[PDB]
């Protein structure tokens, strides 16, 4: 038993990493078949941080101004495109470590693991959830971007995020492997709001269930509700609204557990209307939203890859 | 900025888990040179967990009885011994990707990555302090035992931990590579006391120094105090007591933030008389122990392997 925030293996990742430098700026990129992906920003100078206009700046670069480096090998550009905010580098060979592999653009609310890399060479490994706003909660600092996020399904690496910017308030903000950015955010250094940041009503209550099947159990009550009901408390608390379609996902948990889903949201409304009166919930003194039932459903059944 | 339990990258262990069958029980080995190593209880059948004669139950065991499959090879084995509570297999071939690595026993107090694999297949990897009573609080099914913690060094693997068993608190006990448990706990299934959880607390600084670093600092108080008054309080909340040798790691913390260790221990003192007025600390609302100085600065200056 235990429940632990839990990274996929990263290692058909570290596989991919390359560092990517043009001109001055070092940053990271994932190298797939022959093309490395990585951050169109790896062309600009801190002056021109502020208002890029990147196809002004890229039209003065040529294929041998990126410089492409894998562990300590070079590899030779042939060609480079930009989509969206990410640039495609085309090299003369083929990584030979590959993965199978998918690009996805991936739902606010699910989860994902980071590979944090620094001038090609990775760091370290976290998971992290896609927030209803379509920022995440990770571990950047310069030099982080190109870093990947991805989920692994038996052999194949869905690749979901890539890693470009800081907000505000500490948040961070990048873009599926098409360079489309999740939520509106725009890769230049201007403040850019981030909006309400929602709980993820329906991971919460995966992690409750998660807690009664390990073990805790103290915040079970005699009370049920609706989902009409329980939305109202929501609504208050700043949590997602909760549909049917989320019932219904956590219906092989509920299943599992024999405790009705609205029964757990009975239990979920009074956590958040009288706290937690300083007991904990599998070592955590807050409700955890970045488990999704799925999550809950592999941890606790020993899905391999 | 932003702080993660952050993990190793796994890459390089996961080229060494093996599985190992031993008659109707499988767990999962780990393959260095032409060695593998795995827990002593393969052995066992459901019957013998409660007292197991290790020596009178391996001694019915041939060299062809151990079953060691990387991923879907088979590998020979042409000699087995009994170190402590782990079996060490010789096989034919060594492991083409054996990384550079050491066996080393760690402190009470320090952090490692564990891979969880079930059937010599990888499952995820999370952070996990050794602490100070000897567990680890871990995500462990049935057939994980044989997963490894390692830290990374660069490019040296260093191997600290075999998982082999959970206690009845819900909490894991294992052994280092020799073969040795960490703590008084040995391989048979009766009950056995794990003793107080006390909190780390050169690690709770430690925390709190990465906060202030990533702007939490409401915490900070116009206090001062002395370890002698410090170790007063953290004796009522079962803290380890404070040593010069304590300070002393903290003094890289505590230059690079200009806060004096002893005012920032003035803080802790007042967050563990007043709690935290339902306030949180990098995302937490409760005092995390499980970073070591050296993971702080680990993280917040982005040292790669
Ligand atoms: C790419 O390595 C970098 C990631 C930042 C560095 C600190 N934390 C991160 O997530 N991205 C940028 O430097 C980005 C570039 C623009 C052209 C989009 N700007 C950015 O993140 O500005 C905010 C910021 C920069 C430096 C420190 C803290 C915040
Ligand atoms: C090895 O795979 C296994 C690890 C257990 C399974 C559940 N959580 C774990 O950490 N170890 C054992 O089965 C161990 C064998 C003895 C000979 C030491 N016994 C054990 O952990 O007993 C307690 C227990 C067993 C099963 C479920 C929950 C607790």
Excluded at 18 to 36: P, S, Y
Excluded at 127 to 133: E, G
Aim: aromatic share 10%.
């Amino acid at each position: 038993s235990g429940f632990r925030k839990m990274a996929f293996p990263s290692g058909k990742v570290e596989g991919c990493m390359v560092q990517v430098t043009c001109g001055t700026t070092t940053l990271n990129g994932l190298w797939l078949d022959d093309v490395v992906y990585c951050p169109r920003h790896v062309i600009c100078t801190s002056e021109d941080m502020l208002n890029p206009n990147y196809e002004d700046l890229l039209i003065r670069k040529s294929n041998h101004n990126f410089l492409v480096q894998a562990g300590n090998v070079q590899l030779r550009v042939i060609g480079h495109s930009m989509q969206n905010c990410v640039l495609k580098l085309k090299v003369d060979t083929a990584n030979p470590k590959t993965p199978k592999y998918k690009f996805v653009r991936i739902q606010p609310g699910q989860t994902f693991s980071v590979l944090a890399c620094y001038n090609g060479s990775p760091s370290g490994v976290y998971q992290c959830a896609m927030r209803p706003n379509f920022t995440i909660k990770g571990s950047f600092l310069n030099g982080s971007c190109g870093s990947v996020g991805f989920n692994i399904d038996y052999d194949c690496v869905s690749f979901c995020y890539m890693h470009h910017m800081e907000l505000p308030t500490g948040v961070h903000a990048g873009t599926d492997l098409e360079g489309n950015f999740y939520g509106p955010f725009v890769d230049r250094q201007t403040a850019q709001a981030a909006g309400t940041d929602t709980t993820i009503t329906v991971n919460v209550l995966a992690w409750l269930y998660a807690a009664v099947i390990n073990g805790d159990r103290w915040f079970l009550n005699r009370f049920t509700t609706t989902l009409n009901d329980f939305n109202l408390v929501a609504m208050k608390y700043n949590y997602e609204p909760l549909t049917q379609d989320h019932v219904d996902i956590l219906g092989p948990l509920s299943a599992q557990t024999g405790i009705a889903v609205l029964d757990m949201c009975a239990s979920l409304k009074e956590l958040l209307q009288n706290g937690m009166n300083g007991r904990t919930i599998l070592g955590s003194a807050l409700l955890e939203d970045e488990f999704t039932p799925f999550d809950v459903v592999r941890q606790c059944s020993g899905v391999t890859f």
